[PDB]
Amino acid sequence: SRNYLKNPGFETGEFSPWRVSGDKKAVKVVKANPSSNAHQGEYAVNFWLDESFSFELSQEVELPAGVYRVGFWTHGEKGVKIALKVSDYGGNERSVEVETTGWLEWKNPEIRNIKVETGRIKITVSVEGRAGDWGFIDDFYLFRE
Numbered sequence: 055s056r057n058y059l060k061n062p063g064f065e066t067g068e069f070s071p072w073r074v075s076g077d078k079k080a081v082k083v084v085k086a087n088p089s090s091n092a093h094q095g096e097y098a099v100n101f102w103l104d105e106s107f108s109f110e111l112s113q114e115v116e117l118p119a120g121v122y123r124v125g126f127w128t129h130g131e132k133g134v135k136i137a138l139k140v141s142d143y144g145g146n147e148r149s150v151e152v153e154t155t156g157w158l159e160w161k162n163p164e165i166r167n168i169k170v171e172t173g174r175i176k177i178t179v180s181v182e183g184r185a186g187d188w189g190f191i192d193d194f195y196l197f198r199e
């Protein structure tokens with residue numbers, strides 16, 4: 055299926071056109087080493103800081119009218135709080151909350167059945183880290199159902 059998110063797996067090694075807000079210093083795009091850390095390809099978003107941190111990773115997409123689903127893949131230190139949110143599509147915001155549970159214990163947050171009526175959507179991932187927390191984010195998808 056066509057994936058409507060741009061640079062959805064960070065495989066350029068760069069964020070663009072994703073935007074980072076909040077504690078930008080906690081988050082980078084890396085060539086995964088070991089490569090296990092990425093869900094697909096060679097690159098992933100990696101976050102870490104030695105003090106508590108809060109950031110958002112987001113991308114806006116203009117879409118043909120239709121019904122969509124979005125998700126991504128993450129793993130990280132046991133206890134990191136991550137949220138996936140969708141907004142601005144015509145209905146109220148929807149979110150999913152996940153906890154990472156340890157290295158390579160992959161989680162796949164997903165929101166389905168999003169009827170896009172405004173011709174656009176905003177995809178936002180929120181990360182709330184404790185001091186020393188870390189994790190990886192990769193392999194976004196935005197598909198028309």
Ligand SMILES: OC[C@H]1O[C@@H](O[C@@H]2[C@H](O)[C@@H](O)[C@H](O[C@@H]3[C@H](O)[C@@H](O)[C@H](O)O[C@@H]3CO)O[C@@H]2CO)[C@H](O)[C@@H](O)[C@H]1O
Pocket residue numbers: 087088091100101102157186188189
């Ligand atoms: O569990 C033993 C193994 O740990 C691996 O390290 C894991 C990740 O590969 C690594 O990225 C992560 O490191 C954190 C963060 O991602 C990184 O940016 C930052 O610099 O350090 C953070 C840790 O303080 O740590 C986990 C730990 O399980 C090793 O890759 C592997 O060789 C092996 O030691």
Ligand SMILES: [Ca+2]
Pocket residue numbers: 063064065092093094095096097098192193
């Ligand atoms: Ca990737």
